[PDB]
Design a protein around this ligand. Sequence first.
Ligand SMILES: [Mg+2]
Ligand SMILES: [Mg+2]
Ligand SMILES: [Mg+2]
Ligand SMILES: [Mg+2]
Ligand SMILES: [Mg+2]
Ligand SMILES: [Mg+2]
Ligand SMILES: [Mg+2]
Ligand SMILES: [Mg+2]
Ligand SMILES: [Mg+2]
Ligand SMILES: [Mg+2]
Ligand SMILES: [Mg+2]
Ligand SMILES: [Mg+2]
Ligand SMILES: [Mg+2]
Ligand SMILES: [Mg+2]
Lengths: 271, 149, 104, 77
Amino acid sequence: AVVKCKPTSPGRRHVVKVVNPELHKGKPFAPLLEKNSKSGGRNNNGRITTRHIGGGHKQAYRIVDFKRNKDGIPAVVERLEYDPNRSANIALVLYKDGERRYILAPKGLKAGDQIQSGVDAAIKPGNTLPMRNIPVGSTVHNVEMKPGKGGQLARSAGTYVQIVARDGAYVTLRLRSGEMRKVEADCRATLGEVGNAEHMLRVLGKAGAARWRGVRPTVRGTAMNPVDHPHGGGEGRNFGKHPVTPWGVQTKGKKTRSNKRTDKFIVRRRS
Amino acid sequence: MQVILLDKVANLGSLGDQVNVKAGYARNFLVPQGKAVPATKKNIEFFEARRAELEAKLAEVLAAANARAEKINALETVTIASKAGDEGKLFGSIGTRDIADAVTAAGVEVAKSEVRLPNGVLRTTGEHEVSFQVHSEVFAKVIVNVVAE
Amino acid sequence: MRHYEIVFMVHPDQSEQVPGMIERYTAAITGAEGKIHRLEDWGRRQLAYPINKLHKAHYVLMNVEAPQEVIDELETTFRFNDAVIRSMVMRTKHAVTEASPMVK
Amino acid sequence: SRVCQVTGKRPVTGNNRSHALNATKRRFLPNLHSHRFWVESEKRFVTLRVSAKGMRVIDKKGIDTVLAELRARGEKY
RNA sequence: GUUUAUUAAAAACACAGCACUGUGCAAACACGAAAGUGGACGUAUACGGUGUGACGCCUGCCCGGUGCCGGAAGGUUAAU
Ligand SMILES: [Mg+2]
Ligand SMILES: [Mg+2]
Ligand SMILES: [Mg+2]
Ligand SMILES: [Mg+2]
Ligand SMILES: [Mg+2]
Ligand SMILES: [Mg+2]
Ligand SMILES: [Mg+2]
Ligand SMILES: [Mg+2]
Ligand SMILES: [Mg+2]
Ligand SMILES: [Mg+2]
Ligand SMILES: [Mg+2]
Ligand SMILES: [Mg+2]
Ligand SMILES: [Mg+2]
Ligand SMILES: [Mg+2]
């Protein structure tokens, strides 16, 4: 439910909230939190490695169960919660033996639905079962890449990965970027699309809304000086050269995939 | 790599042969598994004159235990119960340890790396052929039956 | 309740285990106080055209007077049972109990 | 560091003498590889960080010899 | 909002937004002779780069040059 806010002040003129009343308006489950220190984009040498990262609000890492190990114990969903750490909403679930965990929320998962991981699960959104047991053509998310490792594919707000084939030990996955990847069929994969699908509908509206998210201002390269960026300089707005990263490498179209360990798994590249 | 042999190998010859193989095949596979000795003239003395028939004895005390894991293991009534669904539909796959738990219990205490499988997963419930390679010369024709729960 | 006619097409290599399935669908129909009127195995029958890269299948007819909850529950079975190829949950007005023309 | 434990090969320095004979200092790195060697006199594997020349030495002197040379030299393995 | 502490506070930068593009995750990229680290305890609705700069109506033709992308037969071609 998106809400185009009203222009009481310039800066609210274009804010589009995404008001989900189903999210829990309280404190998160404290035994599944830990410290999540910021970095500013600064590695162990102290230098900025990744630019434009800083400030924002303090956050606490919700320990989300991606590996999803509780086989055959049926879980019920206690409530959906907001997660500042990611773009999808998370669901505090409650197993039969009393263990509470967080999972990513599927699309049709509401407060009170049941879920179950394992092999003998039911094929319906929320359940985690190995991809030699999910039918071909279904849409799954939170997909592993190695058996028992942890979900890594389709883990964002409103994404999903289809299972277009199954030939022996591999299944072919149409990824969300359009890329066809062979993953082992023993890799577990939760059914259904991941929940918060209208997350891409939001509009931040004002300059300091991205500052709340740890997104520092991004200076474009043609405004700099010829020592700073390759684009810099000129007596006016001059850009007589090809668009390169500040370290000199081409941007508009140069493919920088240098991994040859995993080219046997990639059936088709994206378009 | 002039290397001496301690057992018959695939495409080069039998015991007591001094074959020139590549260095990777001698170092990584043959020598650590005891199937070769790097042929020093002090080792040709250790082997070819002295232990020509003594190392030939040791290859023949192993074949007596090789034919014995065939003759008593002819029962082929191997019952392994696994959880499954219906008309096939297997919950948990049958590997090579799973076949080497019943034949270990009913037969010889054999390791897991001796089971030979064309399927490897063994999903469909029922009888399945399981060849054995307890040693690289003697084979068996055993069929393991998969039982549901 | 609502009279039905459910005919489905099992893979012919699974023909030896079709009466295993019958004893659970009919159990789920009578498990909801539901009548069954006829149940006629048509055997391995030659296809008119090869679906799923093969030419034969093992047809089963079954007339059913069930509630519509345990029929929608049954439609999800033929979806995720990989042995059955096609299914046809078809609705009829009255409980037809006279046998098929293709039993003779 | 890049030291073959068998032969003691060490990264020496040189020049990139171009076609116009310009000299820029370069390093000749050895062909080191971490490798496991089967020790029949202990029935186990020892992981030596050895150059590709050094594997030729082990296949000529025998592995049970060089591991005695490293004890007498004073380096763990 | 920010900016030349100390002759310039602007029409400059930023900005939300837009688009092209790279990147399947041991990601691309960056800091590092390396281990490693940031990215990110994130997973394409994600991240980096580049351009433009709310909004409204719009964004017309040109692939000859230079770039990048794909084609793999021929031609030429290095060490070996
Ligand atoms: Mg940035
Ligand atoms: Mg921007
Ligand atoms: Mg900018
Ligand atoms: Mg300037
Ligand atoms: Mg420059
Ligand atoms: Mg100008
Ligand atoms: Mg000009
Ligand atoms: Mg000089
Ligand atoms: Mg001033
Ligand atoms: Mg001033
Ligand atoms: Mg501008
Ligand atoms: Mg062109
Ligand atoms: Mg052209
Ligand atoms: Mg080209």
